[PDB]
């Protein structure tokens, strides 16, 4: 159904808040206020009459207001009591922070929790989650970091410890977040439901999911939804547990060689999903997918001042099934107006090590404006002839003057000054990386997504 009021509630109740700040409920309440929630926040605590300068009630039903969401941070023994109260209060969503359910064995209690919640016509997020965040609503209902950079990335984590850590890690890697959602035990609401919402959310342009696994009988629906979504918005999945047990020894060859890992990979392929083997890859690709349109064709140009970096790039592209073709003659001529005759035009276009900053501007600009160029990867190796920041501003200026939107990724290699330059570029929403391989991998992600989308389109082709 609809989750609009979960991410954009008028009123939220933090059950479990305390005078004691060290308590998780209190951490959530502090984040809620610090992050700047515009709606009403109702601390709920038996004895406390006031918390964080807010009128604290002992029960949700005692609240003189239509509560949309209840964040629950009480012991597992007391969760059911609170679920009943939220029910009669007409709450729509219960965000159960609490642990000690299916993950620890008590699945009996978990199914009971869901049944009661459903009885009152209200959904359950979790349990065993660190909460969720929604930037467009200035909503931080987690006990993670106070803040994140604003952007169009939605991140859904099945893992809590890693989920919360990664929440902070997005800041370091300059990834702009629209939403953070912990799904934990996936008792009721899951990735399918959240995918539906993010499909419609105009604030979200990329979705990243840390997935340990899905519930039985839910896979077909996962594919049906994810494929639809994939046509408009890229979905990156970090599949946790992708190492087969091996040798099933079943009553058939199919039973014996077929493994859940290989089936998940196929399901992801059919859904137009990109599968990442590592957090670094996931973040590298997310960044490029968030800041670039998909390439319209295969006319990818690599531009480097170093042959060595150019070869690393070519090897990496080839590993991803991307092979560079001869660049268009129009571009070659356009570049030969300032490049020496002993430069290369085999693609990567080697403009030689002695190239000053100015050539990076002209080369990038020529490439981007050229109607026979679909994409551009720019590689730079720090030399004394140049300044990293000079090269960086050249690239940025060229992108502005091009006045178009063609996917660009940048790779820079060097010391502290290059590190500063890469950060500079990333802070301007230009996908830059400290090595040629990572830049080329990011570009490969853009093409991988293009190919994924094409897969889905073909399978949906009206015969």
């Amino acid at each position: 159904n609809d989750l609009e009021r979960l991410f954009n509630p008028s009123a939220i109740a933090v059950v479990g808040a305390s005078k004691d700040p060290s308590k998780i409920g209190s951490q959530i309440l502090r984040n809620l206020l610090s992050y700047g929630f515009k709606g009403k926040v109702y601390p709920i605590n038996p004895t406390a009459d006031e918390l964080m300068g807010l009128k604290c009630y002992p029960k949700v039903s005692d609240v003189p207001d239509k509560v949309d969401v209840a964040v629950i941070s009480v012991p597992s023994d007391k969760v059911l009591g609170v679920i009943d109260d939220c029910g009669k209060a007409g709450v729509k969503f219960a965000v159960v922070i609490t642990s000690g359910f299916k993950e620890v064995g008590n699945e009996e209690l978990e199914e009971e929790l869901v049944r009661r919640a459903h009885s009152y016509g209200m959904r359950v997020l979790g349990p065993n989650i660190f909460g969720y965040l929604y930037a467009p609503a200035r909503l931080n209902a987690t006990f993670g970091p106070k803040d994140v950079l604003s952007g169009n990335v939605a991140f859904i984590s099945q893992s809590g410890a890693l989920g919360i850590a990664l929440m902070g890690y997005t800041v370091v890697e300059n990834i702009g977040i629209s939403s953070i959602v912990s799904v934990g035990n996936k008792a009721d609401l899951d990735d399918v439901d959240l995918l539906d919402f993010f499909d419609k959310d105009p604030n979200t342009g990329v979705i990243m999911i840390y997935l340990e696994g899905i519930a039985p009988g839910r896979g077909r629906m996962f594919i049906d939804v994810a494929s639809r979504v994939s046509l408009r918005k890229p979905i990156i999945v970090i599949k946790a547990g992708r190492t087969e047990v091996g040798a099933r020894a079943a009553a058939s060859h199919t039973g014996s060689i077929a493994g859940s890992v290989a089936i998940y990979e196929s399901a992801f392929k059919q859904s137009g999903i990109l599968m990442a083997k590592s957090v670094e890859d996931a973040f590298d690709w997310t960044k490029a997918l968030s800041w670039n349109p998909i390439p319209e064709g295969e006319r990818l140009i690599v531009l480097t001042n170093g042959g060595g970096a150019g070869v690393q790039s070519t090897d990496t592209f080839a590993d991803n099934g991307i092979y560079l073709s001869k660049p268009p003659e129009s571009l070659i001529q356009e570049i030969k107006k300032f490049v020496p005759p002993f430069a290369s035009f085999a693609n990567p276009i080697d403009i030689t090590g002695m190239a000053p900053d100015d050539w990076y501007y002209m080369g990038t600009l020529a490439a981007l404006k050229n109607p026979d160029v679909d994409a551009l990867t720019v590689l730079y190796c720090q030399t004394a002839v140049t300044t990293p920041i000079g090269v960086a501003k050249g690239i940025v200026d060229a992108i502005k003057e091009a006045g178009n939107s063609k996917p660009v990724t940048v790779g820079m290699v060097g010391g502290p000054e290059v590190a500063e330059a890469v950060s500079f570029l990333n802070k301007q929403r230009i996908a830059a990386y400290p090595t040629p391989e990572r830049a080329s991998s990011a570009m490969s992600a853009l093409y991988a997504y293009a190919r994924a989308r094409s897969y889905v389109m073909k399978s949906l082709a009206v015969r």
Binding site: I214, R220, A250, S252, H253, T254, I257, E265, Y455, S459
Partner: protein, 228 residues
């Protein structure tokens, strides 16, 4: 018959006999080597001529997992007399190697000339449900494990792409000057296999192994259907 799965389940059976599996597969439009179940030397000869030579004979016992090991299989029988020889030789072979073994009957089936051996599988996953498998079949299936998977029902794209992705795909486009095999027949078989999965909830695993692919059409040589 389509209801064969039902009869098997009601009889507490966890799997279908080769001939039953072949009838059931054939009723979905997947080509199969014509097969009969003989319960006498005379029925065997009759079925041998009804199928055409050369033929193959297989013992049908629950206590005989690996038939070849006990001499429960006779290949390339060209004459009535040669068939009678094989019929008796298999019976006595089984009694000596495994006396306790009960005999259900002897399977007479058309002989399949050599060709590209493929495997087409069907597995019920807890998450995604009916899933189709494709790849090099034969005896060396598990050795390379050169396979691909797709969740059913399969689109033509799904079936077509899961064929091009396996490394051995090269065999199907003419290798060593060899004539390319019928890929469309394979695609159709894959799509139909998917349908079997979707429509028959009682099927846990299925093995079409080997599936000989020829320049024109294909043939399921041996099938295995595991119930649940």
């Amino acid at each position: 018959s389509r209801d064969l799965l039902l009869k098997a389940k009601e009889n507490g059976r966890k799997s279908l006999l080769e001939h039953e599996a072949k009838y059931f597969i054939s009723s979905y439009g997947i080509p199969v080597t014509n097969i009969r179940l003989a319960k006498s030397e005379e029925e065997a000869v009759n079925f041998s001529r009804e199928i055409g030579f050369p033929v193959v004979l297989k013992i049908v016992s629950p206590q005989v997992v690996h038939k070849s090991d006990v001499g429960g299989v006779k290949v390339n029988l060209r004459s009535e007399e040669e068939v009678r020889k094989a019929y008796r030789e298999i019976i006595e072979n089984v009694k000596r190697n495994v006396p306790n073994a009960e005999i259900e009957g002897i399977l007479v089936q058309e002989f399949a000339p050599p060709g590209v051996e493929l495997i087409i599988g069907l597995l019920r996953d807890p998450q995604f449900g009916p899933t189709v498998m494709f790849g090099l079949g034969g005896v060396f299936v598990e050795l390379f494990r050169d396979v691909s998977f797709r969740v059913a029902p399969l689109s033509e794209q799904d079936a077509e792409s899961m064929i091009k992705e396996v490394k051995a795909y090269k065999l199907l486009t003419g290798f060593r000057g060899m004539e390319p095999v019928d890929i469309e027949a394979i695609k159709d078989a894959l799509i139909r296999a998917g349908r079997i999965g979707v429509e028959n909830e009682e099927i846990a695993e299925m093995d079409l192994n080997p599936v000989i692919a020829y320049p024109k059409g294909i043939k399921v040589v041996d099938a295995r259907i595991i119930l649940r």
